């Protein structure tokens, strides 16, 4: 799959799957 834009600029996006996932809110 295609990868979408990353909003990493304040959500730690961690990788996945063609996903982008807010990481920080785990720890």
């Avoid at 979408?4 to 996945?16: E, I, L, T």
């Avoid at 982008?20 to 720890?27: C, E, G, H, I």
């Amino acid at each position: 799959g295609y990868i979408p834009r990353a909003p990493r600029d304040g959500q730690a996006y961690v990788r996945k799957d063609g996903e982008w996932v807010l990481l920080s809110t785990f720890l």
